[PDB]
Design a protein around this ligand. Structure first.
Ligand SMILES: O=C1N=Cc2nc(-c3c(F)cccc3F)cc(Nc3ccc(C(=O)N4CCCC4)cc3)c21
Length: 290
């Protein structure tokens, strides 16, 4: 179904991605405040390239039907400018980053492994359609309810070429460098295996309970030295990762799960596990616990 702009009532700001801005809106065509509450993404600046990149994101999300990926509802077109609005489902519990930071240890290990399994399954499905997410982090995972999370923001997602198994970005923008694999830092190569590296950093995030001093930015900056600034942070991070400098074992993190993190953080690209293996292994761990 099509979404008319006039009937889309603003309620509040939800957040901001890399490029866009996400709002909570009511699609109220009857004009009695009874209509459907939805999430609405729109571009902040609407650049020459960004409008084409945002169209690509819309087509990516529209083609993904999975329980652990956020649901495309529609689009809303406007005027001669052709300014696009992406209509998505509203997930009321917010980002997994904020949700987990609010509750902390009251979310037990069994709940974290359920979220871990769901993130794997979402990512494995994403891999079958040859999409590389390039931004897997707890701020981009969203909570539908207490037993269910979904992968949210596909703003930096790229389609692989037919002949190749990496995407090489030539002119990169803002980059989450503390979630990036060494090959992404050195050569700007992004593949399924570099998304697996980022999944390891998500598993770290989850088992740290989003403690501020224990975050990947905080910990990597401690190892390289807080004195490092700008492009020198990238230089010294590359050398650290090349010499087996890793994020530490989180407080009270079990053995099996810390082993998964480190296998994901392998300098050898081909030795990293597949998302199919990671979903099986995490499910086996949950079966053993419960
Ligand atoms: O529902 C959604 N559909 C898509 C979508 N994207 C994002 C998103 C993202 F994925 C990446 C970056 C930035 C973003 F905003 C967030 C989002 N929902 C919510 C965001 C914040 C709250 C919340 O903490 N609240 C609400 C009031 C009291 C506290 C609740 C919901 C949705």
């Amino acid at each position: 179904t099509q979404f008319e702009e006039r009937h889309l009532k603003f309620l509040q700001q939800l957040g901001k991605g890399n490029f866009g801005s996400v709002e909570m809106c009511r699609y109220d065509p009857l004009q009695d405040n009874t209509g459907e509450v939805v999430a609405v993404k729109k571009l902040q600046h609407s650049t020459e390239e960004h409008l084409r990149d945002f169209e690509r994101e819309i087509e990516i999300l529209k083609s993904l039907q999975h329980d652990n990926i956020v649901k495309y509802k529609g689009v809303c077109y406007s005027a001669g400018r052709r300014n696009l609005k992406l209509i998505m489902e509203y997930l009321p519990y917010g980002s997994l980053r904020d949700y987990l930071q609010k509750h902390k240890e009251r979310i037990d290990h069994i709940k974290l492994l359920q979220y871990t399994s769901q993130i794997c399954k979402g990512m494995e499905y994403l891999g079958t359609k040859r999409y590389i997410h390039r931004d897997l982090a707890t701020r981009n995972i969203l909570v539908e309810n207490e037993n269910r999370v979904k992968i949210g923001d596909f703003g930096l997602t790229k389609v692989l070429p037919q002949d190749k198994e990496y995407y090489k970005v030539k002119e990169p923008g803002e980059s989450p460098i503390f979630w990036y694999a060494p090959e992404s830092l050195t050569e700007s190569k992004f593949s399924v295996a570099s998304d697996v590296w980022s999944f390891g950093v998500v598993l770290y995030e989850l088992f740290t309970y989003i403690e501020k001093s224990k975050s990947p930015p905080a910990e990597f900056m401690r190892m390289i030295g807080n004195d490092k600034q700008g492009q020198m942070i990238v230089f010294h991070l590359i050398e650290l990762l090349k010499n087996n400098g890793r994020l530490p074992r989180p407080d009270g993190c079990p053995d099996e799960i810390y082993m998964i993190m480190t296998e994901c953080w392998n300098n050898n690209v081909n030795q990293r596990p597949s998302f199919r293996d990671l979903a099986l292994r995490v499910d086996q761990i949950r079966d053993n616990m419960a």
